Amino acid sequence: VTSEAYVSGMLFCLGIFLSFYLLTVLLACWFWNIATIAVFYALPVVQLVITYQTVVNVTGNQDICYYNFLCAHPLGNLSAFNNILSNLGYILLGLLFLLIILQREINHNRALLIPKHFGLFYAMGTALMMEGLLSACYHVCPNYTNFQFDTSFMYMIAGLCMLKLYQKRHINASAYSAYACLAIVIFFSVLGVVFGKGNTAFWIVFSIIHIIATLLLSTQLVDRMVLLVMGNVINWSLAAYGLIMRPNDFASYLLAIGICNLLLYFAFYIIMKLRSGERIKLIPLLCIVCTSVVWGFALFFFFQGLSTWQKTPAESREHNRDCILLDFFDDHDIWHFLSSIAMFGSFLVLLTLDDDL
Amino acid sequence: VTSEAYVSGMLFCLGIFLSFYLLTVLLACWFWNIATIAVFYALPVVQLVITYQTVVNVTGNQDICYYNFLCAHPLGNLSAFNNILSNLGYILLGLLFLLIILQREINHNRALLIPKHFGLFYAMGTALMMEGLLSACYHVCPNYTNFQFDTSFMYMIAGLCMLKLYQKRHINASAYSAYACLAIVIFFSVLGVVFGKGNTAFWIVFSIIHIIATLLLSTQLVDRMVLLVMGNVINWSLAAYGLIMRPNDFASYLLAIGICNLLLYFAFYIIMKLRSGERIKLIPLLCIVCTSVVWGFALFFFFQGLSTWQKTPAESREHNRDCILLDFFDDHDIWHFLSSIAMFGSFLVLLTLDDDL
């Protein structure tokens, strides 16, 4: 491809994210526990990517990294520059969550001169920026040994989102455990997935754990009892689909479980708000819809399965598909563009949810 | 070598460590923060070792793992079974630290029916057992990408040892930071060591950091002021030796720094105890000598440099040396046998230090 496509791809990416900065300025005119934990986690992964990428460059063997070889545009020593550039949204849009919460915080403090706790919002903010660093470093050379943290970080942010929801009636102690508990889950998944080919035991044990975990989570949290029963029933239905069909790896299923439960959890809080006399303001109501519709495609684009690290590298090249957007970006890049906006709307639902009170 | 040497090596290893169990029975007749932190750290390292070891077995290329090929005895699919078996002391002798502290704890509770806090001793106990798992897993296939945690864990235990010393006048909050701070130091070392060949900047920046860190540590902690000045002077002398000579990698130096400072820190507490009217009991006085003499050889055996991951694998094979002990164990194995006992005596110095009061 020509260098113009590079310029068009850069201008398109910057144009989308700078439009949110312009919109927030027009509207205005009208802690480190999670950061330290994955700094422990990401850095050993960072070295492996650099070491493996150098091997591919000098050895000539292209069976190491699980790229999208039909559409992967290089620059310098990098083999897929578009896949690294696709995460630019996490940095710019994730940072934009800091100014909006900080602008609220300074307005709150000036005015003083629903519980108010802006600390956890900053934790989600630096969590989204750590996408733009680690998820960029992962894509330099994707591999099984280096896979998990590209999508495991999504769960950490997803869990934190859940924590503030639980903090509706009330944070620091549970945040460390949530990052710590999810770190354990990542490796417990890796241990079972070592024998992933024909892992019938994991197909059953995970379902039993899933049923037990949902009940305990429901128990810890008439309308509530009936509502959690329905959530358990559909959760068992999704697990039954995973146990019966088994069309993708467990890794695809875990991300599928988290987003649907989050959307269910997002929806459920509205049910209490809708059943009660409280009326949802226009902004959260649009935001809930706007967040949900964007999460719709993001799930659709994730289930495409461009590359598979379950099988041999020769078999994974079967699922490569050419660039679709501006002849520079592929389906996984569209996932980054849409998972960034979907998560941005996910926060803005939380920030503006209880403003009516 | 014949299978007898396997039997003699197993009986020798078990005979040494079971002698401590017999001795403790004869004498008697006469939390999870650190555990969770490196479970996050060790497991990604565990996968890399298994993945790399399988590659060596099937590819035939022996340039991946930095073994001691002159003396490395296989069993099953494992390439150096003696190096894995050498860590057996950490499990048996490290576990022995749990019974002695638990036997004291149950005696303390029965009698009740110097501050008493047995929790941190349990943390050191499970730290020593985590040597027997991770340091065993590391030696299955040693490599640069997997190097750090084999000796980085020593620092964590070393730091905890320091914490109880600081707890003389008084724990949980600092333990997490100490493990967290050391996790950062590991990767900050790895980042600089990427350009280790001719890293003149790291040769100077580390010395300045070393000088600043010692002063701040001294400041946080007439006799005290003069004593810390002498400790700083000799610490600057060791750094000056590292900056001038540069005969080994930084990795060898960092372990050298920790043990000497620990022994200095061990010695210094005696100076306050000796200057004061308190008289050291016979057991700690022998234990201080017995711990120190064993740490003497352990430093000597560590500086041998059997394998070097700084250079190419062809150059590292130059420093291989045959088995010395029972035709089964090499110098690094003797390090494991002596670093286990030296650390066991290191704890027993702490446990029995303040019994006279």
Numbering used by the authors:
A (entry chain B), B (entry chain A): 288 to 317, 450 to 532, 543 to 599, 602 to 652, 686 to 821
What does the paper say about this structure?
Here, we present the cryo-electron microscopy (cryo-EM) structures of human SIDT1 and SIDT2. Both structures reveal an overall architecture of a dimeric arrangement composed of an extracellular domain (ECD) rich in β-strands and a transmembrane domain (TMD) with 11 passes, highlighting the remarkable structural congruence. Importantly, the ECDs of SIDT1 and SIDT2 bind synthetic plant-derived miRNA only under acidic conditions.
The TMDs of both proteins consist of 11 transmembrane helices and feature two pairs of conserved disulfide bonds that are essential for structural integrity. Notably, both SIDT1 and SIDT2 exhibit a potential zinc-binding site with three histidine residues within TMDs, which is responsible for lipid hydrolytic activity. Regarding the TMD, while the overall arrangement is similar in both SIDT1 and SIDT2, different transmembrane helices (TMs) contribute to dimerization. The electron density maps exhibited well-defined main-chain connectivity and side-chain densities in the ECDs, while the TMDs have relatively lower quality and resolution. Overall, while the ECD structure exhibits consistency, the individual helices of the TMD in SID-1 transmembrane family members show flexibility, highlighting the dynamic nature of these proteins in performing specific functions in membranes.
